Amino acid sequence: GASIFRCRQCGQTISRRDWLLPMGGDHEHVVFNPAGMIFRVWCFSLAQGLRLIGAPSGEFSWFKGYDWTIALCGQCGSHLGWHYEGGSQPQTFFGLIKDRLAEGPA
Ligand SMILES: O=C1CC[C@H](N2C(=O)c3ccccc3C2=O)C(=O)N1
Ligand SMILES: [Ca+2]
Ligand SMILES: [Cl-]
Ligand SMILES: [Cl-]
Ligand SMILES: [Cl-]
Ligand SMILES: [Cl-]
Ligand SMILES: [Cl-]
Ligand SMILES: [Cl-]
Ligand SMILES: [Cl-]
Ligand code: NI
Ligand SMILES: [Zn+2]
């Protein structure tokens, strides 16, 4: 059974369970933004359906050695998470907010 992560707002296909990545040994990280809100961040090696906004930034990065850019759903513009770059093994990956996705069957 393929298990698809869809944009919770609009239903667009974004990623799948098979594309989870154990970043630092763990494909689901618990992180705090600077306002103190807690996110569960799924780590994916690949994703579809995403528009990236801005130049990379390293500030506040939750993943050492990686800079982020904001990832929006291309269809509806929901803020789904971030793309990470500038690392090694892998160079890049996606960190997507669990509450902003919905996991279900194909
Ligand atoms: O790895 C990341 C991605 C971006 C994220 N981030 C936020 O969630 C945020 C909210 C408010 C102002 C500034 C930021 C910031 O860098 C953050 O804290 N770390
Ligand atoms: Ca975890
Ligand atoms: Cl899958
Ligand atoms: Cl990590
Ligand atoms: Cl964690
Ligand atoms: Cl944190
Ligand atoms: Cl969350
Ligand atoms: Cl952000
Ligand atoms: Cl949103
Ligand atoms: Ni895993
Ligand atoms: Zn969407």
Residues 6+ apart with CB under 8 A from 91: 85
Q: What is the Cα–Cα distance from 85 to 92, expressed in whole angstroms? A: 4
Q: For residue 2, report the distance from its CA to the centre of ligand 6, in Å.
A: 30
Atom of ligand 1 nearest to the CA of 84: 1
What is the experimental resolution, given in Å to one decimal place?
A: 1.2
Residues 6+ apart with CB under 8 A from 96: 5, 14, 15, 41, 42, 44, 47, 71, 80, 81, 82
Residues with CB under 5 A from ligand 4 (ion): 23-24, 63
Q: Could you tell me how far CA 22 lies from the centroid of its own chain?
A: 13
DSSP conformation letters of 45-59: S---SEEEEEEEE-T
- Split into its structural domains, the chain has a count of 1
Residue identifier of the C-alpha nearest atom 2 of ligand 1: 61
Domain of residue 41 covers 1-106
Indicate which CATH number applies to the domain containing 48: 2.170.150.20
